[PDB]
Amino acid sequence: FKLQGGSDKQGFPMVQGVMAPSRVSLLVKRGAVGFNTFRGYQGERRRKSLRGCILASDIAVLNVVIVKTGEQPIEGVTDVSVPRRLGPKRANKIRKLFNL
Amino acid sequence: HSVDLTLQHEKAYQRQTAVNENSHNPNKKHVNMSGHIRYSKKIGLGFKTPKSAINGKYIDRKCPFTSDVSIRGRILRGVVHSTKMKRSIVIRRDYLHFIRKYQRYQKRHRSLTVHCSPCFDPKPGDEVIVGQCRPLSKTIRYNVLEVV
């Protein structure tokens, strides 16, 4: 598995770039993972509190991605395929997809 | 060419930035200063150019005659209060304000500072004419066109 993200028991995200086994307050721009993209005016930063990259016992949830797959299947994940929501809307992609 | 060290005392040199005068030629030799390269500029409101500017040597970047400094809206007159400071004089205008209630005038003077071109050097009590130029120091906005 590769680790990805997850949160504190106060909902506050983990940040890969921040290094702490603790929570600190930092300036967080819109495009960062501590503050949503679509809130506020163009060109802004706020002060949000959040957690570092280093794990401890304060984690409620941890999100991963499978990279290598074991010999023991785990339900709802490696036993299940879910199709794409939408097919391509670009012309040239239809030509790569059906190979026509 | 060659240096004139009468002008120079600076650690930066001084040159005229309008026109190159630093070219070597034998055309600046056997002449007082007349054959030497200069920049000259007319002031077209009836202020006749001096001889000194045209044929001179002097390097100043804060007079309209040897620089791109320009003469604009206001033109005033005033005497000489003092000649003190280097290339800066002190002019005193005097006029009359009127008061309606007493139907009688009063004398009120503006003591003002000006940048006097090194061409001119008027004595105390002389009358000066002064134009409207871009800022040149904190207080100085004027320049000396002519002297009476």
Partner: protein, 175 residues
């Protein structure tokens, strides 16, 4: 922040201005850019005109010009000999307008040798031409003294003109 104003300053009467207004963003200093020698690094800043101006840091090359013949070539900036403003500046080899400097001088040499169809053009250009002595001695050795006549701190390009006799003779004697 930093401001450019007469409203924190004493008057001609020795009195003090009194305020009633918080400072504008129209009036606005910024910290000076330090152009030196070393690898070129250029950090833009956005300005009030809706355009960018470029902060020269550490320019080691300039576009230099030889007077009188109406030419120019690039060459490498090596040293700063002199400056009007301070001695301190010169020692750190900061580049700011009206510093005398030192350049590679190589392209100028090359050029001047080019200054059968070709061959007779040379002989015509050799005629009615001469050069100052103090110039040519230096130009032989492969070093020269020049001045930087563009401000590098707000364009991030350092351009200069090469000293000629009248002015050269002054800066020389100051060393």
């Amino acid at each position: 922040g930093i401001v450019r104003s007469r409203l924190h300053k004493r008057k001609i009467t020795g009195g003090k201005t009194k305020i009633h207004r918080k400072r504008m963003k129209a009036e606005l200093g910024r910290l000076p850019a330090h152009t030196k020698l070393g690898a070129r690094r250029v950090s833009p800043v956005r300005a009030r005109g809706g355009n960018f101006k470029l902060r020269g840091l550490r320019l080691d090359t300039g576009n230099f010009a030889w007077s009188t013949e109406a030419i120019a070539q690039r060459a490498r900036i090596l040293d700063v000999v002199y400056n009007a403003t301070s001695n301190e500046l010169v020692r750190t080899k900061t580049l700011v307008k009206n510093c005398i400097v030192v350049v590679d001088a190589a392209p100028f040499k090359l050029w001047y040798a080019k200054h059968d169809e070709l061959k007779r053009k040379w002989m015509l250009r050799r005629e009615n031409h001469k050069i100052e002595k103090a110039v040519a001695d230096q130009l032989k050795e492969g070093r020269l003294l020049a001045r930087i006549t563009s401000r590098p701190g707000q364009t991030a390009r350092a351009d200069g003109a090469l000293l000629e006799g009248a002015e050269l003779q002054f800066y020389l004697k100051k060393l």
